[PDB]
UniProtKB/Swiss-Prot annotation:
Record-level Gene Ontology MF annotations: 4 iron, 4 sulfur cluster binding; metal ion binding
Protein's UniProt name: Ferredoxin
Chain positions recorded as [4Fe-4S] cluster 1 binding sites: 8, 11, 14, 53
Origin species: Allochromatium vinosum (strain ATCC 17899 / DSM 180 / NBRC 103801 / NCIMB 10441 / D) (Chromatium vinosum)
Keyword line: 4Fe-4S, Electron transport, Iron, Iron-sulfur, Metal-binding, Repeat, Transport
Superkingdom per UniProt: Bacteria
Length: 80
């Protein structure tokens, strides 16, 4: 899973880009819901939210280290 850090400028651009609806508006920043973030494995070759973030604040979430296989597996439980 990835996480949006405190440097988020609340620009709204990454929200609509997530295939799993993992990103939502927070009180201070946008937040990714880790159970929904597959790091875009299964849909795209790269993270879509990272691709559009204007200030490079989405990074790997150290408390949710998943392999290409667990992301794949997550992609599979979220979609079919
Ligand atoms: S794109 Fe980046 S700066 Fe904009 S809301 Fe999403 S995480 Fe924050
Ligand atoms: S990496 Fe993909 S699934 Fe995770 S929040 Fe970003 S767009 Fe969504």
């Amino acid at each position: 899973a990835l996480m949006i850090t405190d440097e988020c400028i609340n620009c709204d651009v990454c929200e609509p880009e997530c295939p799993n609806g993992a990103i939502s508006q927070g009180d201070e920043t946008y937040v990714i819901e880790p159970s929904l973030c597959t790091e875009c494995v299964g849909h795209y070759e790269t993270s879509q939210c990272v691709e559009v973030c204007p200030v490079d604040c989405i990074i790997k979430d150290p408390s949710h280290e998943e392999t290409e296989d667990e992301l794949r597996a997550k992609y599979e439980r979220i979609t079919g």
